[PDB]
Design a protein around this ligand. Structure first.
Ligand SMILES: COc1ccc2[nH]cc(CN(C)C)c2c1
Length: 435
């Protein structure tokens, strides 16, 4: 696998040992060959599982995930997908890694797509080797891959709302259930229904993931209610997955606004990763997968692939050259390589709006490309009336940095800034100049 100009897709089935058995063998070989190596974890929870698997190999942990003292002699770096892309965008030297290993390489967050595009471009140029580890590479059509033990697959109607009757099979279960919901808000309503029926529920989403995931280890629980983030290598001691098979799709309408479309069907990759949370113990057959809909290729036209192009257009590769998307996912967006390339100062603004501002890529780009500076929040208030953000069915209001109460009415509307209570709270703090 470790020959230059090679990209290997390590597509062993979920629970086959990619992370705990194969990755340490690769790293040991890399260190033997003196290859400067990066290991890309999708989340800090995976970064911590990798540290355990790699314990006593010389690896530099470039993450808060882990508390380890580095010797300064490591040639193997480990960091999150998002950190890799972040450091590429910033005026910080990223070494030209000879070997690029991406774990959970199916991850469809914009920074992950961009990282794959950058790495695969370097391999295509003959500059580096790469290994993408995932049971579900781009365009997979198999929602039911092999498992360590047999799975009971049942097509069943799955609740997406509180229920009073008709789903006795959900609560009649005496084991532990991981339930994939299409949104935080939908998870909140299901979680409250289960709690009222006496169940112990933990809720996971992107913003709460590291903190809340520890509860699945530290305390007893009956249900985990999670968004699609638990597709990226999150392990549970569970015997059932309930899968809505639905997700929200960010969609850019008329180049002008982002809406959250759906819920609509997940991809086959997503369905296989949701299912792949169970059947992992060869000694525990008959884990159950209950699925509530079909799969479809809903990544086509999904805003994440356009956002990935915005990131890659702003990463230096060589002279004016621009990294392409990884070939199998390059048709998911109709974008012109370089159309989003920003001048030095606008690019700095773009980066800060993402890193400090915590704005979605698409929205960061609109602001930066309009020549607005990072701390100038007038655009949060000067949009058309149709861009008014609602809070409990009244216009949301914030005090501006000037001390004026104003209606939140952003010049560009991205539904992700107000998709749930936590998101809207964060965007109000931004509009107020609080970060
Ligand atoms: C106070 O102003 C309001 C309250 C409720 C509303 N429902 C629809 C609109 C108009 N839209 C631009 C928010 C509206 C305005």
């Amino acid at each position: 696998m470790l020959k230059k100009k090679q990209l290997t897709v390590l597509d062993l089935h979920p629970g086959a040992g990619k992370t705990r058995r194969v990755l340490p063998e690769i790293v040991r070989e890399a260190i033997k060959k003196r290859l400067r190596t990066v290991i890309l974890a999708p989340t800090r929870v995976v970064a911590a599982e990798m540290e355990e698997a790699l314990r006593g190999l010389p690896v530099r942990y470039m993450t808060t995930a882990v508390n380890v003292t580095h010797s300064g002699t490591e040639i193997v770096d480990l960091m999150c997908h998002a950190t890799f892309t972040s450091r590429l965008l910033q005026p910080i030297r990223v070494p030209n890694y000879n070997l690029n290993i991406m774990d959970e390489a199916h991850f469809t967050d914009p920074s992950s797509i961009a990282a794959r595009g950058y790495i695969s471009t370097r391999v295509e140029m003959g500059e580096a080797a790469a290994i993408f580890m995932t049971a579900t590479p781009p365009g997979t059509r198999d929602a039911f891959p092999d498992s360590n033990s047999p799975i009971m697959d049942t097509e069943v109607e799955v609740p997406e709302r509180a229920w009073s009757s008709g789903f006795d099979w959900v609560t009649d279960h005496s084991g532990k259930t991981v339930w994939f919901v299409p949104s935080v808000r939908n998870g909140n309503e299901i979680a409250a229904c289960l709690t009222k029926a006496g169940k112990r529920v933990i809720q996971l989403s992107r913003k709460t993931f590291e903190t809340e995931f520890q509860k699945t280890k530290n305390q007893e629980w009956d249900f985990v209610i999670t968004t699609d983030i638990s597709e990226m290598g999150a392990n549970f001691k569970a015997d059932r997955v309930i899968d809505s098979r639905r997700c929200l799709k960010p969609v850019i309408l008329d180049g002008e606004r982002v809406i959250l479309a759906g819920p609509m069907p997940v991809t086959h990759a997503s369905a296989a990763q949701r299912r792949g949370r169970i059947g992992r113990n060869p000694n525990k057959p008959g884990d159950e997968y209950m699925y509530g809909g079909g799969c479809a290729e809903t990544d086509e036209g999904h805003a994440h692939w356009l956002e990935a192009r915005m990131l890659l257009d702003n990463i230096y590769l060589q002279d004016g050259l621009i990294a392409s998307l990884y070939r199998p996912e390059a048709d998911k967006v109709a974008a012109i390589e370089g159309e989003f390339k920003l001048r030095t100062e606008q690019r700095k603004t773009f980066v800060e709006l993402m890193k400090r501002g915590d704005l979605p890529v698409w929205l960061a780009y609109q602001v930066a490309s309009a020549g607005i500076t990072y701390t100038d929040r007038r655009w949060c208030f000067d949009g058309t009336t149709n861009n008014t953000i609602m809070e409990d069915s009244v216009p949301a209001e914030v005090w501006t940095k000037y001390g004026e109460k104003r209606v939140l009415k952003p010049r560009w509307m991205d539904a992700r800034v107000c998709s749930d209570h936590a998101a809207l709270k964060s965007f109000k703090e931004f509009a107020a100049g609080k970060r």
